[PDB]
Design a protein around this ligand. Structure first.
Ligand SMILES: *[C@@H]1O[C@H](CO)[C@@H](O[C@@H]2O[C@H](CO)[C@@H](O[C@@H]3O[C@H](CO)[C@@H](O)[C@H](O[C@H]4O[C@H](CO)[C@@H](O)[C@H](O)[C@@H]4O)[C@@H]3O)[C@H](O)[C@H]2NC(C)=O)[C@H](O)[C@H]1NC(C)=O
Ligand SMILES: *[C@@H]1O[C@H](CO)[C@@H](O[C@@H]2O[C@H](CO)[C@@H](O[C@@H]3O[C@H](CO)[C@@H](O)[C@H](O[C@H]4O[C@H](CO)[C@@H](O)[C@H](O)[C@@H]4O)[C@@H]3O)[C@H](O)[C@H]2NC(C)=O)[C@H](O)[C@H]1NC(C)=O
Ligand SMILES: *[C@@H]1O[C@H](CO)[C@@H](O[C@@H]2O[C@H](CO)[C@@H](O[C@@H]3O[C@H](CO)[C@@H](O)[C@H](O[C@H]4O[C@H](CO)[C@@H](O)[C@H](O)[C@@H]4O)[C@@H]3O)[C@H](O)[C@H]2NC(C)=O)[C@H](O)[C@H]1NC(C)=O
Ligand SMILES: *[C@@H]1O[C@H](CO)[C@@H](O[C@@H]2O[C@H](CO)[C@@H](O[C@@H]3O[C@H](CO)[C@@H](O)[C@H](O)[C@@H]3O)[C@H](O)[C@H]2NC(C)=O)[C@H](O)[C@H]1NC(C)=O
Ligand SMILES: *[C@@H]1O[C@H](CO)[C@@H](O[C@@H]2O[C@H](CO)[C@@H](O[C@@H]3O[C@H](CO)[C@@H](O)[C@H](O)[C@@H]3O)[C@H](O)[C@H]2NC(C)=O)[C@H](O)[C@H]1NC(C)=O
Ligand SMILES: *[C@@H]1O[C@H](CO)[C@@H](O[C@@H]2O[C@H](CO)[C@@H](O[C@@H]3O[C@H](CO)[C@@H](O)[C@H](O)[C@@H]3O)[C@H](O)[C@H]2NC(C)=O)[C@H](O)[C@H]1NC(C)=O
Ligand SMILES: *[C@@H]1O[C@H](CO)[C@@H](O[C@@H]2O[C@H](CO)[C@@H](O)[C@H](O)[C@H]2NC(C)=O)[C@H](O)[C@H]1NC(C)=O
Ligand SMILES: *[C@@H]1O[C@H](CO)[C@@H](O[C@@H]2O[C@H](CO)[C@@H](O)[C@H](O)[C@H]2NC(C)=O)[C@H](O)[C@H]1NC(C)=O
Ligand SMILES: *[C@@H]1O[C@H](CO)[C@@H](O[C@@H]2O[C@H](CO)[C@@H](O)[C@H](O)[C@H]2NC(C)=O)[C@H](O)[C@H]1NC(C)=O
Ligand SMILES: *[C@@H]1O[C@H](CO)[C@@H](O[C@@H]2O[C@H](CO)[C@@H](O)[C@H](O)[C@H]2NC(C)=O)[C@H](O)[C@H]1NC(C)=O
Ligand SMILES: *[C@@H]1O[C@H](CO)[C@@H](O[C@@H]2O[C@H](CO)[C@@H](O)[C@H](O)[C@H]2NC(C)=O)[C@H](O)[C@H]1NC(C)=O
Ligand SMILES: *[C@@H]1O[C@H](CO)[C@@H](O[C@@H]2O[C@H](CO)[C@@H](O)[C@H](O)[C@H]2NC(C)=O)[C@H](O)[C@H]1NC(C)=O
Ligand SMILES: *[C@@H]1O[C@H](CO)[C@@H](O)[C@H](O)[C@H]1NC(C)=O
Ligand SMILES: *[C@@H]1O[C@H](CO)[C@@H](O)[C@H](O)[C@H]1NC(C)=O
Ligand SMILES: *[C@@H]1O[C@H](CO)[C@@H](O)[C@H](O)[C@H]1NC(C)=O
Ligand SMILES: *[C@@H]1O[C@H](CO)[C@@H](O)[C@H](O)[C@H]1NC(C)=O
Ligand SMILES: *[C@@H]1O[C@H](CO)[C@@H](O)[C@H](O)[C@H]1NC(C)=O
Ligand SMILES: *[C@@H]1O[C@H](CO)[C@@H](O)[C@H](O)[C@H]1NC(C)=O
Ligand SMILES: *[C@@H]1O[C@H](CO)[C@@H](O)[C@H](O)[C@H]1NC(C)=O
Ligand SMILES: *[C@@H]1O[C@H](CO)[C@@H](O)[C@H](O)[C@H]1NC(C)=O
Ligand SMILES: *[C@@H]1O[C@H](CO)[C@@H](O)[C@H](O)[C@H]1NC(C)=O
Ligand SMILES: *[C@@H]1O[C@H](CO)[C@@H](O)[C@H](O)[C@H]1NC(C)=O
Lengths: 173, 317, 317, 173, 317, 173
């Protein structure tokens, strides 16, 4: 995808994450765990639902039209009726092909984007207390128990609380 | 020691293949179908007013073929013509059959008003053994077969003004006898002539006496014509034999009515979109069931499937 | 202490709602309208050559109805036909009226060249009280009503070669008298016959004697026909009564000319795009004023508004 | 938007910035201020003008066509004339709808992108002398008066001049 | 000291200008053309079955103009009609020429089956000096000019049932003599009449006696008509003079056949896409060579070039 | 482009890189050099080939149609035949114009993206051992000979090996 996260620097998805589309796995002093991120998940879902709302249940009413099957050979007029219809169908068929290709490229890109946004947000949050391992994981350079990990996931992590501990751990020899 | 925090995304074990700008096969976590590819095999009677032609074509119902008497004055959103339909009255043809069928279909009504045409000097109500109604010889219900009276057929010059605020549709015909003999027996002179006119139109027809191949054992024919007469205008029938006269006019309306060729049975159900294959759901934007449709329908496309991604790229573990 | 440096972007208090792929309502700082939804209610006389039909249809101007004499030999880019137009000469019809109107409209000229047809044995220049010009009985300016001379109408066999490098358009007609009496009074024989031919075509017409409903109190008619004659070809009129003869030919050109039905007044202004509602600006790519257009025009669409974002997402404080 | 800056990590726009689309607000020893960035502003504007030039004042000339209103009932030919026109209009109406949706998605994304580019450029410029606070703001870890702030905005800021001061401030206890 | 590591991308000295959403001129490293703008100037004989009309129109090959005898029973995917084609048999016209040409073109075969029509009381095989075959007077190969025998022409009433499982296409005509004299010399009565009918159709034609401008010095004409007869149906020719009789029927098929007007020479080569300019390669999705095409062809567009970027933005050093 | 790398923070391309689309130039103790990155190059090429495969050699067969040139003036029917064809051609011409514009915007953006992905990947790889100079170059704060540079290009660079040396060089006075 165009952001390079999904099928990119994130090696693979998590089949065992069934309560969200994006989220966090951690390991700390109290174990290892997983939690879905609802905001990023909802952001992706809302956008996909927006597309769907623009395409599902939105059909157009037509009534009396032209004939499109013919039991007799007639020549010029019938040639024209058939050509008009063939023309129309090919144009709509093209429209449908293009629409799906564009929509699908865009869906993949926007979902990749949301993954990237969550990663970026988390990176900035951690400030000088963690380093990016390159695979979507941060090495957090301080004790970070379950409440600490929760604080990161919930946006209440105060980097200043841990900064001294983290800098000492990062920049030791 | 510290901690590790990994960001990630879900995946499924059963992904679906979709197309993009650059890839004709890429797996996403989920997708939805955009092409409706099936029908339920019946035309739902709701919410459109369906009129099943059964054995009658619309034109036969119009003319009043005896098996079509139950159709008198009926309206429809969609008239359904069956492939088994057949005529069983006097054999006929309609020059520009397709246009008459179309304009009646589109009008959406068989509403007929009788009118008292001044037919003096001729025998009215001619019947035939080629058009049986309730075991008697009969004729088209909406047509009046005029023949000689006292071995005479005088020159008709009959007027009918349209003082309504709607158009009137007149259906009338010419009889083509099989022989010069039959011609004189019916109309008292060797050569028929019909002129039907209005302020803004004139249609002139000469019969062609001669044999045609037999249809239901009849080698003669009737040719059917029509004339629309607007408000303030007047219908003039100026004839000297061979006229198959109108008994009145059909109302012509405008609106959403049409006609469809189908052998699908009518069901007691509710579906907005009708195709000749049967009604189809209209949740999807596209369909490949039939290019022929009526109502709020997905657009016909050639593809049998188009999958819209509804999830991210699927990257299994 | 140090400093803080914040990156940011503008916003406005009055944003505009636009559509995207995923959102049918999202606010941006600015947008521009892509659908032209109004006209100025008049058809600008510039830069296209406008010919206002006034009381004349193009066909009436062609035939030379007396109120249309001011139209002789005029050209147009766009002929404008008014709904109030009416004929006031001999009542007539044109089989495939629509095609003659179209081909003349498209040609864009009423340029007429007189030709000296050899009309021997008949009275030329027939007139009527149904076609008044300058208080006298008259006729269509471009047509020559031929009648009997000395109670005779001999067989005409008149030739006119096209030795020009352009096509010639010939307009001619058939008169339908009201009675067998009137027929003999005018043409000396009971049955008319007209044959107009070229190397590559032949049109044969028999008059139909009889009453039609009165138009401006006249119950007779003229039926109008046309014939195009190419370079190296020849017009042959082989007639024995009832001919309404051409006096010459119209030039047929090709180019950008057309015709439009409109009641919008002509204004002294300059606009590239004409609709029946009036001229419309053509800055926008789309318009919902009228599907009927002439000139450099936005494309007709069903939407009444389509807003193109011309700024970023608007995120007020 | 797909970059996550506008209506993303940048909380909101600035109504009081009327001389550009993107820019800088600062606080330092000499006060607080705002300045537009002309390059990013012009980059967005140029792209939007490019679109507009592809759509405004570019109409197509048609002359004699087919009739599209009819005073008489005719059947087959008129059915065909009406169907051809209805077909055409629906195809153009679709084209117009799609065009605007795509253009608008793209305009939002490109404007989000330019915001992101300016942020990234500034981040790299500051090197080890500042940290990203996560909301589009950098905490600059040295005295940075008006000329200093100007130097950042103008691309003449020499990070080496302040690096010792900044590192000492960043990595203190 | 340490090191420096710079990330970068390629560039070329000769970039190509392409269009994007926002820029009508931006340079990329490489691009490919999407509009085919040239032909090789010849129509490849493979892989479609090409039939070069040479001096014959399809209709002349159908009727059996003597220079077209080599075309008998041939099939084609594409019939190529040359602008130099000319008729050299009895001068004729075809009402709705365009439709007959179209339906034969589309059928893709000149397969003709002779049938033994019961022509009793008339002289068969009439010939003319206007249709020379092998230095003798002749006629159209597929048509049978019937004339009087022993100064009589009795009433014909000839039947031909279609007991095949395909449709039959019948071509027949009416002769228009130049004089009442010539009429009697040929058909023994002053007025011809032809009626051709089936169960589902009837075509009636009266000759028009009179002069037409000379074509190859002949001032008389033949008008050509056609009739399709389905399985279970019957052809009835009920005539009393002036009939140009069919000798049999053409098979009508359906499939991929057509006709094209072109003066491009036929080459010994292989190309899927044919235009009147010659065959064109079909690697590109679009083409601006000709709106007229046959086979697997790029779609006609107005642009003469559309460059698809196949590389990144080019940023020279 | 939408990522801001190509014709953005990367000042210009390299005409002398003829064996790939993206790559690395270095300077170290043993000289200066260039090497193509095959993975990023192939990622761009694969995507462009994917487009091409959707557009080249994929034509549609039509056989008997309507006439499109006329030797006689006919009026209504011919007006309709001409209008149907003109309608069709204008719709396809629009489709072709739009397609190329969208495809080309996308090609530029995806190629910009791949440049950006390679830069990001390299940045993360280097961890605390290098700093981003803002122009696509990293100042690597340790001795990094040819094998070392090769290890970065090949994804076998072990940042821990050099971290002490690099931190000392970065955070000196
Ligand atoms: C894969 O993607 C598709 C598309 O996003 C997704 O299908 C959607 O699923 C939802 C939920 O299952 C469907 O919503 C339902 O639609 C039906 C039929 O129209 C309605 O009857 C339902 O209404 C009831 O339920 C609602 C709450 O869910 C109640 O609020 C309501 O009052 C009713 O009780 C309901 O709206 C939706 O129709 C489909 N969409 C499509 C296009 O099929 C699918 O679930 C995804 N698959 C996976 C594995 O995620
Ligand atoms: C919201 O977005 C729209 C579209 O981007 C934007 O509208 C544009 O504004 C500019 C400037 O106001 C307009 O440009 C003018 O157009 C008129 C009419 O065609 C011309 O007469 C003008 O020419 C004069 O001025 C020029 C300098 O501005 C001179 O160089 C020239 O010689 C003339 O003196 C001028 O070009 C432009 O037409 C509109 N575009 C559209 C599509 O309306 C609008 O301003 C934006 N709104 C906000 C609040 O930003
Ligand atoms: C600029 O961009 C275009 C499009 O990407 C690019 O053109 C392509 O180049 C390749 C390689 O030169 C072409 O591939 C060849 O096509 C021909 C004709 O169809 C085939 O005969 C060739 O087959 C032989 O070679 C193959 C290996 O290359 C063998 O495997 C095979 O068995 C044959 O021996 C070959 O497939 C391709 O056709 C073009 N595409 C287009 C649309 O023109 C061009 O090279 C790029 N320019 C630069 C400077 O990069
Ligand atoms: C002119 O030719 C037509 C067509 O061939 C002739 O029509 C045929 O006329 C005969 C005479 O009765 C018909 O025979 C009848 O058939 C019915 C049905 O099977 C049968 O029950 C009767 O006992 C009788 O045999 C025949 O069907 C009919 N054919 C067609 C195709 O219509 C006609 O006789 C000729 N006319 C003249 C005046 O010579
Ligand atoms: C055949 O029928 C037509 C149609 O009904 C008859 O036409 C009518 O003829 C009368 C006789 O003159 C017309 O009356 C005149 O009307 C004018 C206008 O108001 C008036 O000024 C005169 O004093 C006179 O009353 C009548 O308008 C006309 N009707 C129509 C509809 O055209 C015709 O008479 C019949 N023909 C024959 C030969 O019997
Ligand atoms: C009715 O008018 C037509 C059309 O003008 C007359 O046709 C013309 O008839 C003459 C008499 O033979 C033709 O002349 C011949 O021309 C040929 C070819 O050059 C020449 O070799 C002969 O020696 C002779 O001169 C003339 O071509 C012909 N014109 C056309 C246009 O067909 C016809 O004579 C008139 N009919 C009657 C019955 O009066
Ligand atoms: C709906 O009916 C149509 C028309 O009968 C079907 O399309 C035809 O299918 C048959 C058999 O598969 C083919 O021989 C014809 O060539 C098809 N005609 C056309 C015009 O496509 C169609 O298969 C039916 N669809 C469904 C879902 O029932
Ligand atoms: C429609 O026509 C069919 C066939 O003509 C009718 O079915 C026949 O009806 C007769 C008379 O009652 C029965 O003797 C036969 O059993 C039926 N024949 C066949 C082949 O089915 C049918 O009744 C008519 N339907 C309507 C609604 O009028
Ligand atoms: C331009 O004129 C057209 C045609 O008269 C108008 O469209 C019609 O509007 C009336 C009244 O609103 C409706 O009853 C018709 O159904 C409309 N016809 C069609 C074909 O759409 C249109 O409103 C006018 N537009 C402007 C801007 O003046
Ligand atoms: C177009 O026709 C109208 C109506 O026939 C003309 O208006 C009438 O002209 C007469 C004769 O001078 C006047 O007595 C009336 O006052 C007008 N009647 C009405 C109802 O307006 C009009 O003059 C004609 N216009 C042109 C340009 O010839
Ligand atoms: C293919 O032939 C067509 C038709 O002859 C050419 O298009 C015509 O070109 C001439 C001279 O340039 C113009 O006068 C006509 O107006 C064109 N007609 C149409 C319908 O466009 C075309 O130039 C030829 N193309 C090639 C590549 O040979
Ligand atoms: C097609 O017609 C042309 C012209 O009618 C024929 O060419 C002439 O043939 C004659 C008779 O052998 C020669 O005397 C002339 O030299 C030719 N004239 C011209 C102007 O070329 C040609 O032979 C015919 N072609 C076919 C295949 O029948
Ligand atoms: C974080 O939010 C979760 C979700 O509701 C909550 O249960 C948890 O207590 C929070 N943890 C911390 C440390 O704030
Ligand atoms: C995938 O498998 C699950 C598990 O049974 C099923 O519920 C789901 O509907 C499947 N989804 C798709 C899109 O195939
Ligand atoms: C019309 O009616 C009148 C009066 O009855 C009569 O003289 C005339 O011949 C009729 N016309 C036709 C064409 O029958
Ligand atoms: C928004 O408001 C300002 C202030 O009056 C006005 O000048 C501007 O034109 C408005 N813009 C839009 C797009 O509504
Ligand atoms: C054509 O003119 C000639 C000579 O005047 C005449 O004999 C013939 O009858 C005319 N034909 C017609 C159809 O009037
Ligand atoms: C930065 O550029 C501005 C804009 O012209 C200029 O006025 C200012 O003096 C510059 N400041 C510095 C510190 O370079
Ligand atoms: C650019 O120049 C090179 C060097 O001669 C040439 O081989 C190549 O084909 C050119 N490419 C394009 C796309 O013009
Ligand atoms: C008519 O010509 C055909 C074909 O040359 C021949 O078989 C037949 O015997 C001829 N018929 C008569 C009656 O001369
Ligand atoms: C049809 O043939 C019969 C018998 O030969 C004859 O009486 C009748 O006049 C013919 N009809 C025509 C129109 O020639
Ligand atoms: C890196 O990979 C290249 C490419 O094959 C190889 O030749 C080189 O030896 C590798 N260098 C190191 C230091 O791993």
């Amino acid at each position: 995808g165009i952001f390079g996260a999904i099928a990119g620097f994130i090696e693979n998805g998590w089949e065992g994450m069934v309560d969200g589309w994006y989220g966090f796995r951690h390991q700390n002093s109290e174990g290892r765990g997983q939690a879905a991120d609802l905001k990023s998940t909802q952001a992706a879902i809302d956008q996909i639902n927006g597309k769907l709302n623009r395409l599902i249940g939105k059909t157009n009413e037509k009534f009396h039209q032209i004939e499109k099957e013919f039991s007799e050979v007639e020549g010029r007029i019938q040639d024209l009726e058939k050509y008009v219809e063939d023309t129309k169908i090919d144009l709509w068929s093209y429209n449908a092909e293009l629409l799906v290709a564009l929509e699908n490229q865009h869906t993949i890109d926007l979902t990749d984007s949301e993954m990237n946004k969550l990663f970026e947000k988390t990176k900035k949050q951690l400030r000088e207390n963690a380093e990016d391992m390159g695979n979507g994981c941060f090495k957090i350079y301080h004790k970070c128990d379950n409440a600490c990990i929760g604080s990161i996931r919930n946006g209440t992590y105060d980097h200043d609380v841990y900064r001294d501990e983290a800098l000492n751990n990062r920049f030791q020899i | 020691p510290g901690a590790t925090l990994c960001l990630g995304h879900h995946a499924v074990p059963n992904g679906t293949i979709v197309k993009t700008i650059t890839n004709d096969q890429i797996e996403v976590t989920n997708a939805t179908e955009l092409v409706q590819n099936s029908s339920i095999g019946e035309i739902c009677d709701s919410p459109h007013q369906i009129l099943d032609g059964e054995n009658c074509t619309l034109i036969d119902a119009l003319l009043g073929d005896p098996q079509c008497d139950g159709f008198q004055n009926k309206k429809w959103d969609l008239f359904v013509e069956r492939s088994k339909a057949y005529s069983n009255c006097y054999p006929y043809d309609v020059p520009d059959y397709a246009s008459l069928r179309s304009l009646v279909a589109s009008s959406g009504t068989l509403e007929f008003n009788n009118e008292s045409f001044n037919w003096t000097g001729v025998t009215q109500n001619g019947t035939s053994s080629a058009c049986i109604r309730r075991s008697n010889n009969s004729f088209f219900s909406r047509l009046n077969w005029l023949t000689q009276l006292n071995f005479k057929y005088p020159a008709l010059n009959v007027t009918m003004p349209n003082n309504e605020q709607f158009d009137k549709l007149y259906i009338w015909g010419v009889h083509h006898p099989v022989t010069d003999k039959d011609q004189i027996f019916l109309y008292a002179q060797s050569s028929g002539r019909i002129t039907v006119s209005t302020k803004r139109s004139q249609q002139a027809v000469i019969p062609n006496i001669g044999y045609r191949p037999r249809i239901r054992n009849i080698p003669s024919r009737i040719s059917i014509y029509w004339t629309i007469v607007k408000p303030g205008d007047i219908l003039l029938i100026n004839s000297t034999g061979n006229l198959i006269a109108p008994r009145g006019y059909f109302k012509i309306r405008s609106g959403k009515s049409s006609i469809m060729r189908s052998d699908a049975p009518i069901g007691k159900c509710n579906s907005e979109c009708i195709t000749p294959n049967g009604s189809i759901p209209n949740d999807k934007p596209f369909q490949n069931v039939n290019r022929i449709t009526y109502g709020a329908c997905p657009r016909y496309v050639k593809q049998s499937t188009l999958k819209l991604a509804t999830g991210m790229r699927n990257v299994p573990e």
